[PDB]
Design a protein around this ligand. Sequence first.
Ligand SMILES: *[C@H](O)N1CCC2(CC1)OCc1cc(Br)ccc1O2
Ligand SMILES: *[C@H](O)N1CCC2(CC1)OCc1cc(Br)ccc1O2
Lengths: 543, 549
Amino acid sequence: QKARGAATRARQKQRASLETMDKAVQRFRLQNPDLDSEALLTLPLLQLVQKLQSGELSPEAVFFTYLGKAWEVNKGTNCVTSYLTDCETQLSQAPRQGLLYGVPVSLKECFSYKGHDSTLGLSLNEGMPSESDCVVVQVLKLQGAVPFVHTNVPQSMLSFDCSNPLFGQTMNPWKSSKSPGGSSGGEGALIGSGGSPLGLGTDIGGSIRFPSAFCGICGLKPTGNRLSKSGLKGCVYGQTAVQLSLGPMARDVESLALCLKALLCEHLFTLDPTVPPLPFREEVYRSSRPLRVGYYETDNYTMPSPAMRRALIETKQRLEAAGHTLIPFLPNNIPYALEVLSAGGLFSDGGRSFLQNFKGDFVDPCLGDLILILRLPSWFKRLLSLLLKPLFPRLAAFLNSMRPRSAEKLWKLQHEIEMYRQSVIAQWKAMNLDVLLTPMLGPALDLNTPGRATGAISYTVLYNCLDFPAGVVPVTTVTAEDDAQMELYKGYFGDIWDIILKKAMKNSVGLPVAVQCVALPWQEELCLRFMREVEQLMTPQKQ
Amino acid sequence: ELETGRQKARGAATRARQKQRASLETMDKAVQRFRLQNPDLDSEALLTLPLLQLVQKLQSGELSPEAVFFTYLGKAWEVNKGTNCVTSYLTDCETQLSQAPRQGLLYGVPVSLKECFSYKGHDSTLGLSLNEGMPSESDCVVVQVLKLQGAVPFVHTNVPQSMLSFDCSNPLFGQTMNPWKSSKSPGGSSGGEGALIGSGGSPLGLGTDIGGSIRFPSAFCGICGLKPTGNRLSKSGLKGCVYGQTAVQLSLGPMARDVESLALCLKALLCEHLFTLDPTVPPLPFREEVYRSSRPLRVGYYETDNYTMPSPAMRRALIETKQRLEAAGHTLIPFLPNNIPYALEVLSAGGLFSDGGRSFLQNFKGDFVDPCLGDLILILRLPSWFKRLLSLLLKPLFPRLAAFLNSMRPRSAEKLWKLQHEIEMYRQSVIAQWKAMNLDVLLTPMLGPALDLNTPGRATGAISYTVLYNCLDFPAGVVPVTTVTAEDDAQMELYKGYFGDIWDIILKKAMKNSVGLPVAVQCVALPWQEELCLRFMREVEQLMTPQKQ
Ligand SMILES: *[C@H](O)N1CCC2(CC1)OCc1cc(Br)ccc1O2
Ligand SMILES: *[C@H](O)N1CCC2(CC1)OCc1cc(Br)ccc1O2
């Protein structure tokens, strides 16, 4: 009843948003027929900002052209959830000396904006507009950047798919039957199709890296508190065991570094003193000195697809030819880190704070049985845990960690994560590494299957638990040779997560594959430096 | 559960006293052999000189690293006979003396360590029986960087049992006494550090802080101490009683005679060595331009926090430093943090005792309970229903005891997240209030003067001026300003307290007969801005004690 009314009123807001967008771009295109839209969109962000700084391209020109593309791609992707109205007034009042002057920036729905709903796919958050912009949006406006639209998220944001009962289902710009990723699926679909040159997204299980790999764009996940989490909307507040991180999303890695340099200014540390005043170290990013790179083709938990395995080896061979030393490195106790530390950290209360948002609301099929399993009693979760332990160890250990704990059990878990963080650093020091090469979950999965393939977060959620800066960059396209070899895929366990993932990665010719890059905590510039190296060797067209 | 007795704890303390006695014997044999070699070496001229002039004469070559070592080592031995602040002498330090890097910033500097800092082949007992007879395999990160910067760690300082008290007494190493007065407490939990530096045994030291453990002994003994942001320095290797507690942030910092030595210690620690060995700490360089800045500051201040009544000595110290800052050219604004009782009663007490002290009481199993902790142990051991029953009964009469006892109850993981979110919301609250008055720095009346023996554990509410900024994770420092006059101690009969419970009665009695004792002031800056905090601490020190600069 209430969920039905909230969905109907949200769709009216979306219709009004798209109608305002369409009438604004036609107003600009007819008044400015001299402007070339094709050369505008193909132009990289680094070439875009210098033409905006000099005055070759007006802030009005770059804004409504990208807005025109954003509205056109939304027809087949359904990624834009709300259009920000007062963006046209911000355009005229943009600071010239800002690093991102006249840059249209897409925002995830969790990023609160003045006079806009941060629904997150829930009914209780619908009809509650934010009365103030969040710190990271504030500094974008202070740095000249103009946020234009909000992007769609999956219900509750706790899934790497992208669908909600309020605004609908987001689709991959490359293939209709495929998921655009999540929970920044709206960001991936928009930037991947060329609707936005720059974007922002959150991450706690891989929410930046998933849609970036699925759509073929670059996304960075910084350390827990490298950027301001103030003003950000979520379902569970106070979860510190698994570190939540917000980061940039763009077409190329060079655009991510300029975004990070802009946000890491005086204005961020003034508006949020809780974030350490770490400036963007240009010296570390621009570095060309040979790196000692750790690598692994598989984490022995989730079997990589033929497209993933080929992408990891090709990057390795290109880096070896460049002069970088590649050393086989694998983190200790990975299944232990995912099953009881990562899953136990996110669900220490049994999901009781999480399920509070689902009271009197529809459940989206993209989540799957995620809600039905969490609603089970603590004794019923434990009973099925030791019963299915000899059958499938993955589902059993995950279900036991989704049980409610006490305050004593949380500290025991918090200390174990602190011990695990130091243990991997001990291995990082012993092997003497600068950066880490990791396969990224690819290619794009089918619609309503990511929620049923839980184990696939293994390559991403590990570095949320570790709180390591992780970033992804598209390196190759899925050749029909790789898609054919998906028939020999079986998995190490053969449980439901391996069965669904086998079917979901099929029929994926033309989809992009990315590779994950991991550096030591607080080293975002070093992570981006390696991301710059991987991109240059694999896709020389960019940069 | 079956009682194991105290027999295991008795033998552990017997072996702990021996390690203390043998240390002093090794210290005595070392300083006597040096004095026979150097008869014309001036000791009083060596000790009186500040660390800044000491490090300059060590870098130039005027004074040998051996000369400054054995002079301070002998002074540390002499003051220990009246203070009892040294637990153990680090045997492998004379080898480090010759191995100390000449180009290091702290070259040839004798540095005292708190027992929580783990040293290779040395016990970090913390006052507990189970922690003794358990030597550390390697030095901790912050001790490693001291050795890399040329500093020579030589002694472990005394701590109260479990470190959860601002007194300083343990059943294994004994009781620490204030170098200024015998009957007075030297502070805690870095009470050994305060007593050693305050008397002149150590020019520089390190200590932990989660409720004011750097700031308390600094004010009680009359020395400078800085508590930075929780994650500004490495916590790796630091031994504690409880692990996994992230609600209230644990912080570590420098302790010295003057403020200029604290900034040199922070600059030496903040180097490539620290960030490599512990990547969890952000690579923030020590901003010299901020510390050396002589620009006028917008300073917030308050005479009282409306929770714990300041002594006439505290009131006088706060006003005197406030007025002299105004004469310098600084603008002083009446500022008070919102909902202080909320931060202490339910956020700090609830954060530190989320499990009801269940992991904390694990260390006290079959071990002695030191009188300096008071009834803290007996209160924690009570069941959840008994803690709740007394909370409802004491609420109408004693509001402070009701909220503290209720927050010391075991809760679920759901309630911990709500609490941890309430802390970061409160952190954003005071930050928003900070901007509203557009402050640069904050001035707080630090708890003073020194309390009596075995009274700090019975006067819980006194941590109100210190634990507030552990909950807020604000870098706070302490600098001595003035001593107690005959008029200050005489006005203690007029002292009553804002609540009139047992905490105000004991604190009234504990601050009596305090003529001559030092009283300090607290300086608070915004998170991650401890270099700005020291800049203000330098301004306070220069205007109140110009002889230190
Ligand atoms: C975005 O970071 N994101 C959060 C949820 C996610 C991945 C997508 O990570 C944790 C998790 C845990 C379970 Br039991 C099921 C699904 C996810 O997905
Ligand atoms: C060192 O920071 N330190 C820890 C214990 C202390 C002060 C000294 O702070 C917390 C606390 C809590 C209670 Br209920 C009683 C006493 C203290 O002291």
